[PDB]
Amino acid sequence: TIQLTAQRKYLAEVQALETLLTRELSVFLTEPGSKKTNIINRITGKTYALPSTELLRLYEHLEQCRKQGALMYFLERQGTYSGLMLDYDLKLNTNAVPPLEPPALSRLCHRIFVHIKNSSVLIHFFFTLKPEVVQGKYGFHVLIPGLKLAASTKKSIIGSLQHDATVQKILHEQGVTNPESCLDPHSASVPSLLYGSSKLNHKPYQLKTGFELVFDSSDPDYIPIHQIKNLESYNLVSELSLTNEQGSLVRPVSLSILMLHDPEARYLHKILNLLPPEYYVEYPLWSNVVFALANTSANYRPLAEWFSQKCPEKWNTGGKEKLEKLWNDASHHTEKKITKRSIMYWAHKHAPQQYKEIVEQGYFSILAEYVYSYNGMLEHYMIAKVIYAMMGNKFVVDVDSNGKYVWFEFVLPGQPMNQGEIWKWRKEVNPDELHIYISENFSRVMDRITEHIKYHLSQPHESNILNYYKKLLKAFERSKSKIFNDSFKKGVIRQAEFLFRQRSFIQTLDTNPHLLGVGNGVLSIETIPAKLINHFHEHPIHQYTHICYVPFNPENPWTKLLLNALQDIIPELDARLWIMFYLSTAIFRGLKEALMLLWLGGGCNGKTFLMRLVAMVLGDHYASKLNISLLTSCNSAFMRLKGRGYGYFEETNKSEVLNTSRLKEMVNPGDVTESFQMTATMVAASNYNFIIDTTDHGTWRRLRHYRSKVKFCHNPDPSNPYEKKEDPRFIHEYIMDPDCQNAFFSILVYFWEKLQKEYNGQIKKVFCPTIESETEAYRKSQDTLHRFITESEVVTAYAEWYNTNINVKRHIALELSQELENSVLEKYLQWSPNKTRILKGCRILHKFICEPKNKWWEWSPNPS
Amino acid sequence: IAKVIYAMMGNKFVVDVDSNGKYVWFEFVLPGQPMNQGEIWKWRKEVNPDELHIYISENFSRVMDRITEHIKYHLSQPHESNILNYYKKLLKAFERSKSKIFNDSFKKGVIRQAEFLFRQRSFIQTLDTNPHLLGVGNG
DNA sequence: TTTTTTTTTTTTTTTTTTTT
């Protein structure tokens, strides 16, 4: 990795090889599966079928790049005609080199000559071996490219040598404990390696001896195996090539493509291998990770498929086909977009002490490649990319309506913070902790590079590469200080805000109505029971409340006090259940029914006590007070309740008259207007009474009413259930008590769960005998024209009656005729020849249920 | 220099962010210093660090003089050629950077780093929350 | 003299303010 970039840097011949491959050998492309190719680079798996000219040129260039001592991973495959290539997996007892002798090698040459004379015959012998010092000794490859007899005869020779005992005896003389299995039967059926072609994470072979032995068809009995002199004068790479017939010295007698494609694929491979496959075993978590990877692009379909082969008993007959089914589902899925952050968190949880150094090596290699690319001159983007690599799941950047860039940070426990922000996101204006991380936390990692370079400077090298390393260190010393310059940090931040940008993040914030932020995390009320997330998540939550959640415990003394006081406020069990059910829906933030709740009382009743408690429990984020002038009037006023699920009015003190206007506009769940939506529950209470003049069929259907039957005063009235001693403590205090608020929140969420499980989230399903009884009584009331009848001249007289009875105001006689006709005067209606609706039979007088056992919150059975 | 400021002279000032987003400073006054009348032992709001500038220029220079004389002393000690050359390069670099403390741009950079290092979360809102504390002209 | 020095640039602001 690092050495690859180094060699690409301080070796011009490597650059020449790269240019030759990219320009000249581009036209010589070969299919990966086609066998017409002759050269395959194990680095990139590029199949090539170079002609003789390209073959000789590449042989020469590889000869040079070998002769300085570089590294190369090119391989050749035997064709229809080829020389002899052999493998000896000499797994000796000890990894100690025996002094193999040239006479012994000549005896081996005689043995192989005997083994080949009993075949088709009409030679240079090269012995190369590993640099040794490795378990089970080294491996040996004799190379004989002189002949061309690539056929099953090679298999026959391999078999003949397999049972050969002379070679085994020679090996035993060389102290080999493994006389057999060193020569694999598939030696000639696999591609070979050119001289200097090392194995992956291994070292290239080095030649040992070269012996020239001519042959004669008439009588090969004479054998001059006499040693070759001065092999260095020849291009050994070209001479040793099987496909090279024109040699001078010699004579012619899909996981891989995924790992090759970008490093993030293999990084995901590693991090997926880090955690145990136990989570993969079960369907839920495995499907979760498949969905998560499918959300992040679609190229990882084989990658997940690669992860699918594990547990074949669960993969085949099941997992295999459901894998592609889930992939097809996720290709169009839009409900959730889990990303690699969850996988990183899982690797954090399950397998510690290892992913730290793994990612450290990863981004250290990234930064080493960066610094190598431009010789120690690093700029704002150059550091900013590594910074993005550092904290990829900690910060996010978005653009507001004004266009200003704004940051957001995922507050977690164990860091300095405010009260009630753990495990959830907070807005932020100018990255502060990012600056310290850049200047200090990052500073350690690059220090590693420093010593790393010094390490490579400590090792002996050539003068030119040593001078290059000295220049690299000198350049890097200048960039050393720039981690502290403030203009440098400002430029780094300005560059990085582009990298950290995430499109469509502010507008999708808080869009889930079932997710509510609390003092100790976030609650998802999507399912029953609601789930508290006290760990990493992937949800856009910014609004919250400072009320910590506790499980609904009726055994809490404060819970008992709240239940008793709430029962005392309105003793009617059915009415109490209905009103608590209505109030428990304030937590929901989605669309709701077009209803408002208003209820009246004489005064000094249970009003304005539970109202303010509910308001403060919901909080400023989720609740908003509203002025009474919203409905009594004939625009920041309408901007209220944006996302707030609870709307309420203060005490009216005096009496007010509704204008019949904006009433339908504040209740409908449709468009109201800029355009915005309304999702809130409306609750109103007053000491006095209102005036309503309308009898539309839609109206009085989208409306409810109630009257308080209790009275609270300082002097108790004995034997009167409708009077109880007011408890000032309830008001002045019992609000600031955090435990009281937590218990109240638990009680409200309990009633919300009860409503969801019983009536499936509809207030229409739940009915109270008291409700729609007092409501219909009020509906029968608030009628004036019908009352006037039973008490242009008719409409005029109605006008003065209304003025002198309730209120004096301007009147319009055009429409009032319609309600007068629709009144009880329909039967007493007759027409006129002048097309006028004159009146007959008229004369203006102008002369004078059940109770709970011990738990009303138990809600009783369905009738309640 | 900002970390040195935080360490040496850090228990006198606090930095916070207002609603408008402008960074603001607060200082804990002590007896015997220029100030207004009758506010001793309380916290004063302040816009752009003034006494911090004098502290950086005067006290920090005195401290770095100690480092300078320490380096000169260890240079005076007998040593090999390589370590002597290393110390000499340190000497030229440090004396070239000595006068940089008085740069107004550098000083403002130190201030804009201090406004990050000296920040304390949840400080403006926690001011004067206790109803029982009443500031008076004598404390 | 040439390689190196070196070196002031730069930076900051300056102006932007942005403001009702």
Ligand SMILES: Nc1ncnc2c1ncn2[C@@H]1O[C@H](COP(=O)(O)OP(=O)(O)O)[C@@H](O)[C@H]1O
């Ligand atoms: N369930 C209850 N038991 C005892 N006292 C109560 C109960 N509910 C309310 N109270 C008290 O009765 C008083 C009624 O006055 P208040 O609610 O202020 O009248 P209004 O709501 O008309 O302004 C309150 O001070 C409250 O403390």
